[PDB]
Amino acid sequence: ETTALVCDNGSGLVKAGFAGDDAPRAVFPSIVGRPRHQGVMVGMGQKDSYVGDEAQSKRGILTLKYPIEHGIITNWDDMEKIWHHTFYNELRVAPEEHPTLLTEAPLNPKANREKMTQIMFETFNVPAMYVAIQAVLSLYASGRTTGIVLDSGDGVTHNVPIYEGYALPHAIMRLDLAGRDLTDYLMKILTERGYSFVTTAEREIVRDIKEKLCYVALDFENEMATAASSSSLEKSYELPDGQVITIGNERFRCPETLFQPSFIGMESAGIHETTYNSIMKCDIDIRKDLYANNVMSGGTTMYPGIADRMQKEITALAPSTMKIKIIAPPERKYSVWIGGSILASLSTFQQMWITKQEYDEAGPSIVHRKCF
Amino acid sequence: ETTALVCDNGSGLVKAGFAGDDAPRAVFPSIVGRPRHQGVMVGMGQKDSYVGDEAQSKRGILTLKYPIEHGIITNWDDMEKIWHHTFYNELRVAPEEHPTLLTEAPLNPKANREKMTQIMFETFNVPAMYVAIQAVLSLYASGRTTGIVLDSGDGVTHNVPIYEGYALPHAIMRLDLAGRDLTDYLMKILTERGYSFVTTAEREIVRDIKEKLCYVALDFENEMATAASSSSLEKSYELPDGQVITIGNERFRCPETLFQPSFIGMESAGIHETTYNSIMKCDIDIRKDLYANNVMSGGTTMYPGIADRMQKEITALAPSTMKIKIIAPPERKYSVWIGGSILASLSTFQQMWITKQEYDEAGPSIVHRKCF
Amino acid sequence: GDEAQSKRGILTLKYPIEHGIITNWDDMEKIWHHTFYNELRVAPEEHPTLLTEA
Ligand SMILES: Nc1ncnc2c1ncn2[C@@H]1O[C@H](COP(=O)(O)OP(=O)(O)O)[C@@H](O)[C@H]1O
Numbered sequence: 001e002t003t004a005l006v007c008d009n010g011s012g013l014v015k016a017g018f019a020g021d022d023a024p025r026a027v028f029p030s031i032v033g034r035p036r037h038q039g040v041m042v043g044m045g046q047k048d049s050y051v052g053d054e055a056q057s058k059r060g061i062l063t064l065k066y067p068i069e070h071g072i073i074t075n076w077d078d079m080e081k082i083w084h085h086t087f088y089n090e091l092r093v094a095p096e097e098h099p100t101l102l103t104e105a106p107l108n109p110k111a112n113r114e115k116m117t118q119i120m121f122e123t124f125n126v127p128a129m130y131v132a133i134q135a136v137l138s139l140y141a142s143g144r145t146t147g148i149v150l151d152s153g154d155g156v157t158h159n160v161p162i163y164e165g166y167a168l169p170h171a172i173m174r175l176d177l178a179g180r181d182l183t184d185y186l187m188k189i190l191t192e193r194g195y196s197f198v199t200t201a202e203r204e205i206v207r208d209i210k211e212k213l214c215y216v217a218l219d220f221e222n223e224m225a226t227a228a229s230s231s232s233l234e235k236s237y238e239l240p241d242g243q244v245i246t247i248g249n250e251r252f253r254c255p256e257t258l259f260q261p262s263f264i265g266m267e268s269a270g271i272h273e274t275t276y277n278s279i280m281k282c283d284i285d286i287r288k289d290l291y292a293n294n295v296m297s298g299g300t301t302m303y304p305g306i307a308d309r310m311q312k313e314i315t316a317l318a319p320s321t322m323k324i325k326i327i328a329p330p331e332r333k334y335s336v337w338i339g340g341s342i343l344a345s346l347s348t349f350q351q352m353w354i355t356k357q358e359y360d361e362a363g364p365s366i367v368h369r370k371c372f
Numbered sequence: 373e374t375t376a377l378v379c380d381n382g383s384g385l386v387k388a389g390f391a392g393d394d395a396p397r398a399v400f401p402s403i404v405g406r407p408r409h410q411g412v413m414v415g416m417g418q419k420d421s422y423v424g425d426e427a428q429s430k431r432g433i434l435t436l437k438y439p440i441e442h443g444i445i446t447n448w449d450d451m452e453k454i455w456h457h458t459f460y461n462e463l464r465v466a467p468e469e470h471p472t473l474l475t476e477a478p479l480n481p482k483a484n485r486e487k488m489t490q491i492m493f494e495t496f497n498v499p500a501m502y503v504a505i506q507a508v509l510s511l512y513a514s515g516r517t518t519g520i521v522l523d524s525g526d527g528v529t530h531n532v533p534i535y536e537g538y539a540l541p542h543a544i545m546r547l548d549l550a551g552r553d554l555t556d557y558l559m560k561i562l563t564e565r566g567y568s569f570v571t572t573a574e575r576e577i578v579r580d581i582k583e584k585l586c587y588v589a590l591d592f593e594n595e596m597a598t599a600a601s602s603s604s605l606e607k608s609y610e611l612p613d614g615q616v617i618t619i620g621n622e623r624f625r626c627p628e629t630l631f632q633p634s635f636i637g638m639e640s641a642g643i644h645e646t647t648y649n650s651i652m653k654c655d656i657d658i659r660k661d662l663y664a665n666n667v668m669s670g671g672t673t674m675y676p677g678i679a680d681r682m683q684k685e686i687t688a689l690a691p692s693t694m695k696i697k698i699i700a701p702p703e704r705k706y707s708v709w710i711g712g713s714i715l716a717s718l719s720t721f722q723q724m725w726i727t728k729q730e731y732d733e734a735g736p737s738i739v740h741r742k743c744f
Numbered sequence: 745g746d747e748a749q750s751k752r753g754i755l756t757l758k759y760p761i762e763h764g765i766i767t768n769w770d771d772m773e774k775i776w777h778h779t780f781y782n783e784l785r786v787a788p789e790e791h792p793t794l795l796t797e798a
């Protein structure tokens with residue numbers, strides 16, 4: 001009778017809805033805006049904190065804060081505000097009669113799970129809850145049981161291999177390189193053409209430029225030579241004050257940081273080498289099914305041409321006698337929520353929620369022994 | 373056998389001289405004045421424009437323009453006229469047989485730099501030239517190879533960390549808050565006492581008031597409290613007509629914009645926070661030396677008490693077991709030119725010059741491959 | 745060697761030996777030249793050398 005809630009809680013966006021639906025209902029950015037200037041007109045409902053899309057609507061006079069930074073909930077009061085907004089204003093449900101499934105990146109500190117369990121059980125008084133891993137839900141929404149999942153959101157890029165439903169925890173890769181860092185790099189390299197963007201409001205403008213105009217080049221040096229030789233790669237964008245900017249080679253220099261992370265000073269490997277070393281740390285017999293099932297998920301995998309670039313780099317890295325297939329659905333930026341909707345709707349799942357009585361008898365540490 | 377020219381062409385002043393010397397010869401402000409009233413006297417040796425100190429003396433009948441605005445050269449004919457003035461009239465030097473060294477703030481757009489190459493080679497026809505970063509020359513004048521440089525001039529305030537001669541480009545911070553913004557804020561808050569300063573001639577008068585009477589307070593709140601409760605902090609200044617003004621809490625409120633930049637409505641952080649984030653973005657081992665080698669340069673660091681205040685503010689943010697030393701030599705106003713003179717007169721430097729023939733096959737884009 | 749430890753912030757560090765097997769022979773030759781010439785300060789032409797292996 002009761003319908004479980006699925007709330008995919010990413011670093012940049014939050015996707016909330018009911019289990020069983022095909023698409024989430026409440027998709028809105030996880031920001032809290034606070035007023036920065038002097039309020040002179042008395043009345044008219046001047047609130048002290050705006051949460052969600054109205055913070056985007058009034059972002060010119062607000063300082064904007066992300067409570068989740070690289071998968072870490074830093075400011076818990078703002079995250080409680082976002083949870084209150086997504087329960088009472090967006091979905092408009094009573095949380096004390098609905099189970100709630102939550103998502104989390106792996107290799108994340110254990111205080112985060114305990115504090116989410118404490119806030120969801122004590123403040124909102126839910127009857128049951130569960131915390132799941134995002135890549136596992138991506139493989140659930142993919143409809144298969146074997147594959148290696150590369151999930152990259154706004155703050156974290158993780159990589160999990162699963163064979164026949166059994167995960168390999170020693171081969172899970174994590175990398176703090178995602179859309180926030182790509183946005184900051186694009187803010188850095190727009191100053192070469194004279195466009196200055198510094199404030200937190202215009203960071204969203206640079207993010208919109210990144211979403212609309214960036215793509216992954218198949219060969220970087222040839223695309224450098226093509227951009228230097230001609231001007232056919234240039235495109236124009238309209239700022240919301242009416243100014244028109246144009247960008248050339250900055251379209252594909254920005255997602256190249258995912259493949260060459262020495263552009264922002266990190267000495268770590270690119271995502272193709274991260275996927276290759278995740279496959280090579282796995283056992284000898286399961287690599288053949290993992291090369292053919294590179295499941296691709298998350299929001300920063302929506303660049304044009306990223307899948308062909310991953311195909312070229314992994315086929316270069318792997319031995320030539322094998323087939324490498326990369327699975328990129330067109331709905332892959334919602335795959336974590338769709339897998340959460342699939343998982344909460346199974347009849348075989350309904351005994352492994354964390355009930356209120358288990359929390360009362362075991363404290364917040366029940367989430368370590370039950371979830372994962 | 374020829375000598376190199378060193379020309380620090382900062383946004384407020386031009387400081388030019390020969391390499392190997394210890395002090396610059398031609399120091400004059402980067403202004404171009406044009407007449408704004410009608411000429412009624414026949415003869416008199418009247419000119420269409422004035423430059424440098426000659427524009428400074430006759431400023432009552434002139435409109436003054438700064439060709440450099442926050443580091444970016446806006447008007448190029450005026451900058452060409454200032455370069456012609458500092459070559460032919462100030463230094464008495466024919467520039468076709470002396471190589472020249474120029475300075476530039478980091479994260480500037482590229483299109484200045486090539487043009488800064490182009491009319492150095494096509495107009496003045498120098499045999500060689502080079503463009504350097506100001507903070508690197510500050511470390512050259514300091515005599516050491518490890519440190520983080522806070523260089524704040526008239527238009528650009530930037531932090532650059534260098535460890536063992538290796539710069540870290542991902543940790544360079546730029547902030548467009550410097551002496552002109554402090555001057556405009558001082559013109560804004562001087563209207564509270566009834567003193568109006570609106571024209572561009574009397575902006576120089578307010579700049580002189582800022583140079584003579586302003587200081588950085590150690591703690592802001594008790595300084596405001598003792599400014600309100602007494603009159604010992606007040607000082608008097610004589611205008612060149614004869615009028616005498618008296619200022620009180622405006623002496624320390626105008627440097628406070630460097631530490632509290634919300635006074636002019638800017639969302640960004642202060643210089644202590646900017647230096648702390650620039651240190652914290654660096655690698656984990658090198659932060660031991662970066663706390664102990666804070667180097668200041670530029671005229672905006674000439675306020676009394678800025679070093680003690682910056683030490684107290686960095687000491688609050690850093691952990692208590694780290695030793696923080698700020699180096700503020702009394703000659704650090706001229707330190708960019710001194711490092712330019714040390715670098716140009718150095719023996720292994722004379723193969724990094726961008727000569728005439730390399731510009732001839734490479735176009736103006738030689739400066740990106742060679743300089744920095 | 746030790747001067748790579750003192751400057752390890754601005755360096756990437758590589759081990760030529762990985763699980764006992766020498767992988768990068770140029771870096772191993774560099775370490776051998778450093779330990780013969782800069783640490784023991786001897787010429788290898790007049791000293792027999794004993795080596796160890798797993
Ligand atoms: N079409 C697109 N092209 C490029 N980047 C995108 C696109 N759509 C979303 N993104 C990026 O994905 C990031 C967040 O995606 P997502 O994983 O759905 O949210 P979260 O990280 O909150 O889970 C955003 O920072 C955004 O920049």
Ligand SMILES: Nc1ncnc2c1ncn2[C@@H]1O[C@H](COP(=O)(O)OP(=O)(O)O)[C@@H](O)[C@H]1O
Pocket residue numbers: 381382383384385386524525526527551552579582583584670671672674675705
């Ligand atoms: N004694 C002083 N006290 C306070 N500020 C000063 C002093 N001398 C110069 N300044 C400020 O320094 C700014 C620029 O100085 P400087 O860095 O030498 O020139 P540039 O910015 O061209 O490199 C000027 O705007 C001036 O207001």
Ligand SMILES: [Ca+2]
Pocket residue numbers: 010152153154298299336
């Ligand atoms: Ca996500």
Ligand SMILES: [Ca+2]
Pocket residue numbers: 382506524525526670671708
């Ligand atoms: Ca300067």
